Ligand binder design. Structure first.
Ligand SMILES: CCCCCCCCCCCCCCCCCC(=O)OC[C@H](COP(=O)([O-])OCC[N+](C)(C)C)OC(=O)CCCCCCCCCCCCCCCCC
Ligand SMILES: CCCCCCCCCCCCCCCCCC(=O)OC[C@H](COP(=O)([O-])OCC[N+](C)(C)C)OC(=O)CCCCCCCCCCCCCCCCC
Ligand SMILES: [Zn+2]
Lengths: 236, 231, 30, 488, 72
């Protein structure tokens, strides 16, 4: 009503007063405080023309920069803090994979002296936290996780795994079904069959978890506020 | 510390400002001042230890450089760096690459003045997943990814430290040396074409950084913003 | 789009500003 | 209204507020339109508002609150004594409600009736202070005690609630029964029940006569009765047990509010209807018994609530020692001690309530409060050292003026026992506090910390305790006014 | 000088109430002024009331003189 109009005007006035006080405070400060900006961060971007091609049913955490020509298929996930930077050469990851948070993928030597190096990740590959992948070809259903790093034209194959510190270097053809470790990499076991089923079940249930995180992380402000008030009132 | 007194009273005043603004908003009937959104200022100060990046030096908007950190031209701070300069400053020269997933850290306060600085002198590549805590790396340096440089280490003048390797306290890698493994032991010598390649990679990443920044300055794409406000 | 559309809050705000004005007047009559 | 009821405006207003809050609570607690809101918090804040309004009315109106001299003298007489006692009572009730707001939601028990009784017993006690007849006194005491009976057994799904409430009910009802028989015998042997008549009939001429053997039995029974309601250390049965069982807001209110009321009532009767040595002797014994018991029991306890119970018994004892003689200086120091004790105990309960949930029942859970919350540990040490004794604080100053008055009044015996129980308390406590940086077995980092109002109330009282000695003139002056105008 | 003691008292008590709960000292820097005001008005009124009650007590003692004058 008219009362509403009046108090709206009054609220606008005192809000202006607040802005003025804030500027006065920054100017009493000054030179030091880097006042806040908007996000200005890209979850997806191109480089020269290559736009990313991302499946619809994927999860991409809004703290994961995909840049270049990244072709990411179905039922996969690019978790938090991730960096899929293929600005120089092609990146294609299989369908049903998962890059568990805070990992990186880069490629270097596009079409120099004839020899080229793409980078491909097979289906149902579960690369873990802090995994560095620098120009590699990981065939489908292979396990790499917890801080591993692959240096060069390495190719892992068909259920092989490198675990927890594997620094694999300079064009290693990983045998079809093993485990490696070591700094540098050597094998020490035989990768039992129930463990193969472990990596498969890992890919599957991790796709499930990624779908949950997507449904959560892709909400708007009003829906989030509703969810929060409902959670509080219910826990009451 | 009169500056710090001014800073504190500035906080009081600006805080009263925020509070009176919020009272105004509640009166106006608009609770938009709750849309939780990460601050993450890519460049941050503490009291007067603000960073200083030279113009034309690409810093990815997802980086995090805070504390007394100073960096010169032709440099690149690629997505996912933590450049801390709280206790002892970081200085980084020209034509340098600090790649994505790297921190140039400074040891949390040890008792004495044992908090060494960190100097990264121009024409240096510091690849992905690189932790440099309190070190002195010099011109024409290669720190190939998976790297750890613990406090007290000095690498210089066309020197390479391979990959996935850590260098303990008080170790020096002078010209023409590669060290690797846990701990970092000497392997072999270098090659002149490899040194020229160091320089060429430095230049190539300088150009890459120019491109990435010129793309990051592309007007924010209002269409997606109005989309996300629609639904 | 130039008004507040919550009746209860507006009544409460009227009461609050009346309260502060009354206290100021009371003090003025100390 | 009619210009006579100007003498009972605080009581009229507090009763009307109680009724309107009761109706509001019940209807909007059972109204299906809203979800099914439990109105404990809203009813509580409205109750605190009503209590502050009562405080305002009473305080700003006293000189016309004495307006209905005789027509009200039929039941009660209001003098400066009743004025200041009622003010302190309303302050204590506002304080305890504000302190107990956060407990309601945390412990999660939904009954707004809990905060329609606090007000009702408050009006009862306001009647009890300004009470000038034996039966009006008894009726006010019964109304208050019934409110507390309801308040005790709150949470039914718990265990200690029902047993503690039943113990308290039986104890209180027995006490009131004894008090009733006492008033009955006084009536029978004397033929009057209004304090003016009792004074005029049995002052000075207490000389033994034919049927003088009756009055004495009545006053003895009244002494026993009123004693039971001051926890009566020979009759202190179950007092630590009920303190431990009943919830923390309830036991806080039970410790602070009724005790001041019954002390004012005891003073009003002992000035008027006593004997040369009957009441003074029936209290001189309980005083030393209380100090001794407080010492030799609080020395060894392993539950942070029972320790509070026995320290309360000890301080009630010190107060009763102050009661010993009947000179102006003595009663002055008596009232001062009452006030300081009220403050210290609301403080201690603020702390033990802000340390509640993660420490359901423990004393060893001083898990490095010096390390996990230093300011709170310093505040607890301050409150306790004040509770026992140390260089200038509030409790030390109060005990010192108590013993000053006792010595100067002709009793060279209460001081030794008083000082020695004080020194054993001090050794124990200062051993406990200095036991807070030896080592720490358990650790209970707490989700509890003191929302806003417990913190404000604490901060206020704790700043008062240390800062009391730099200017204790007005308290002495107002206490002198009060005690002097109690009878003269 | 009374109002200054009151203001410092209010500010101290407010910093206290902000320090009990572990949040920083000057959390709401616009409460501290209310604390100073309340402390000032409290101490001023306390001095006024102490003077008044001393006056009333002295009058009461003067009247008690007559109650014992007739005693002699
Ligand atoms: C010069 C002084 C200008 C003060 C302008 C009014 C400030 C009101 C701030 C406010 O809305 O506080 C609400 C909050 C309520 O807290 P809350 O937990 O409900 O959340 C809102 C908190 N802010 C304001 C940060 C959004 O009040 C408090 O926390 C305590 C206020 C104490 C009383 C302050 C006013 C003096 C009386
Ligand atoms: C002014 C009194 C009032 O009712 O304000 C309503 C408005 C709006 O009420 P509201 O319902 O939007 O929220 C007020 C409740 N808190 C503060 C906890 C968020 O509240 C205030 O102005 C309170 C802060 C200023 C107090 C002075
Ligand atoms: Zn690279």
């Amino acid at each position: 009503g008219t009362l509403g109009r009046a108090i709206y005007s009054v609220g606008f006035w005192i809000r202006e007063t607040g802005q003025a006080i804030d500027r006065l405070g920054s100017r009493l400060q000054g030179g030091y405080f880097f006042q806040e900006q908007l996000s200005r961060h890209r979850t997806l971007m191109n480089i020269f023309d290559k736009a990313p091609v991302v499946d619809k049913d994927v999860f991409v955490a809004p703290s994961a920069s995909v840049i270049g020509d990244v072709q990411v298929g179905r039922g996969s996930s690019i978790w938090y803090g991730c960096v899929l930077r293929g600005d120089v050469n092609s990146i294609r990851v299989g369908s049903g994979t998962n890059i568990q948070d805070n990992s990186l993928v880069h490629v270097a030597k596009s079409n120099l002296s004839g020899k080229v190096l793409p980078t491909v990740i097979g289906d149902n590959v579960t690369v873990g936290h802090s995994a560095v992948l620098h120009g590699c070809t990981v065939e489908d259903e292979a396990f790499v996780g917890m801080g591993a790093v692959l240096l060069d034209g390495v190719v892992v194959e068909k259920n092989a795994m490198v675990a927890a510190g594997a620094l694999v270097r300079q064009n290693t053809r990983i045998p079809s079904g093993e485990v490696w470790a070591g700094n540098p990499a050597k094998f020490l076991r035989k990768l039992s069959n129930e463990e193969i089923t472990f990596i498969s079940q890992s890919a599957i249930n991790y796709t499930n978890l990624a779908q949950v995180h997507a449904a959560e992380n892709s909400k708007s402000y009003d829906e989030i506020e509703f969810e929060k008030v409902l959670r509080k009132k219910y826990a009451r | 510390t009169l500056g710090r007194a001014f800073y504190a009273v500035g906080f009081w005043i600006r805080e009263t400002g925020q509070a009176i603004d919020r009272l105004g908003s509640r009166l106006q009937g608009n609770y938009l001042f709750q849309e939780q959104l990460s601050r993450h200022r890519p460049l941050m100060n503490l009291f007067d230890k603000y960073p200083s990046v030279h113009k034309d030096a690409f810093v990815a908007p997802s980086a995090s450089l805070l504390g007394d950190v100073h960096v010169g031209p032709a440099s690149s701070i690629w997505y996912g760096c933590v450049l801390r300069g709280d206790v002892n400053g970081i200085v980084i020269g020209s034509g340098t690459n600090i790649q994505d997933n790297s921190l140039v850290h400074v040891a949390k306060s040890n008792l004495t003045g044992k908090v060494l600085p960190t100097i990264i002198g121009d024409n240096v590549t510091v690849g992905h997943s690189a932790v440099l805590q309190g070190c002195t790396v010099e011109d024409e340096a290669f720190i190939g990814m998976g790297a750890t440089l613990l406090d007290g280490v000095y690498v210089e003048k066309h020197a390479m430290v391979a990959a996935g390797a850590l260098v303990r306290q008080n170790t020096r890698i002078p010209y023409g040396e590669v060290w690797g493994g846990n701990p970092a032991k000497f392997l072999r010598k270098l090659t002149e074409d490899e040194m020229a390649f160091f320089s060429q990679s430095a230049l190539n990443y300088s150009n890459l950084a120019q491109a990435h920044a010129a793309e990051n300055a592309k007007e924010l794409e209002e269409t997606e913003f109005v989309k996300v406000l629609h639904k | 789009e130039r008004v507040s559309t919550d009746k209860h809050r507006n009544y409460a705000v009227v009461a609050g500003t009346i309260t502060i004005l009354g206290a100021l007047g009371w003090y003025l009559k100390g | 209204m009619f210009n006579l009821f100007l003498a009972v405006y605080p009581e009229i207003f507090i009763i009307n507020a109680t009724f309107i809050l009761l109706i509001h609570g019940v209807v909007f607690s059972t109204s299906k339109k809203y979800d099914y809101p439990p109105l404990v918090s809203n009813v509580g804040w409205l109750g605190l508002l009503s209590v502050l309004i009562t405080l305002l009315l009473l305080a700003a109106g006293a000189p016309l609150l004495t307006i209905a001299h005789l027509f009200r003298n039929n039941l009660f007489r209001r003098d400066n004594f009743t004025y200041f006692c009622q003010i302190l009572l309303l302050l204590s009730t506002a304080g305890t409600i504000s302190m107990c707001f956060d407990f309601f939601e945390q412990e999660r028990f939904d009954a707004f009736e809990f905060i329609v009784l606090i007000l009702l017993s408050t009006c009862s006690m306001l009647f009890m202070i300004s009470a000038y007849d034996s039966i009006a006194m008894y009726l006010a005491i019964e109304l208050q005690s019934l409110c507390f009976y309801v308040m005790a057994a709150s949470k039914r799904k718990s265990e200690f609630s029902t047993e503690a409430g039943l113990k308290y009910l039986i104890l209180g009802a027995f006490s009131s029964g004894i008090l009733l028989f006492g008033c009955s015998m006084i009536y029978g042997s004397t033929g009057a029940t209004h304090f003016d008549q009792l004074a005029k009939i049995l002052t000075g001429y207490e000389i033994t006569g034919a049927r003088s053997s009756g009055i004495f039995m009545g006053i003895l029974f009244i002494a026993v009765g009123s004693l039971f309601k001051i926890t009566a250390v020979p009759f202190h049965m179950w007092a630590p047990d009920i303190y431990e069982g009943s919830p923390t807001p309830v036991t806080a209110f039970l410790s602070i509010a009724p005790k001041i009321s019954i002390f004012a009532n005891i003073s009003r009767v002992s000035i008027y209807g006593s004997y040369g040595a009957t009441l003074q002797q029936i209290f001189c014994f309980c005083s030393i018994a209380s100090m001794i018991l407080g010492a030799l029991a609080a020395m060894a306890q392993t539950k942070v609530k029972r320790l509070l119970a026995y320290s309360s018994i000890g301080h009630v004892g010190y107060i009763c020692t102050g009661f010993s003689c009947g000179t102006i200086e003595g009663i002055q120091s008596l009232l001062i001690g009452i006030f300081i004790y009220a403050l210290m105990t609301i403080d201690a309960f603020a702390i033990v309530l802000a340390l509640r949930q993660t420490r359901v029942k423990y004393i060893a859970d001083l898990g490095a409060l010096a390390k996990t919350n230093p300011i709170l540990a310093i505040t607890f040490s301050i409150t306790m050292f004040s509770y026992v004794g140390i260089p200038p604080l509030a409790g030390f100053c109060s005990k010192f003026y108590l013993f000053f008055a006792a010595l100067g009044c002709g009793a060279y015996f209460l001081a030794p026992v008083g000082v020695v129980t004080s020194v054993i308390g001090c050794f124990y406590y200062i051993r406990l506090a200095k036991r807070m940086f030896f080592d720490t077995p358990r650790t209970w980092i707490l989700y509890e910390p003191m929302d806003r109002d417990k913190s404000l109330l604490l901060a206020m009282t704790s700043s008062f305790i240390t800062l009391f000695f730099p200017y204790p003139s007005p308290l002495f002056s107002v206490t002198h006014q009060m005690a002097l105008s109690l009878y003269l | 000088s009374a109002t200054t003691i009151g203001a410092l008292l209010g500010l101290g008590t407010q910093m206290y109430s902000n320090a009990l709960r572990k949040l920083p000292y000057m959390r709401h820097p616009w409460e501290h002024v209310v604390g100073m005001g309340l402390g000032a008005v409290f101490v001023n009124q306390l001095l006024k009331w102490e003077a008044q009650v001393e006056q009333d007590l002295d009058k009461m003692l003067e009247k008690a003189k007559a109650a014992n004058e007739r005693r002699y």
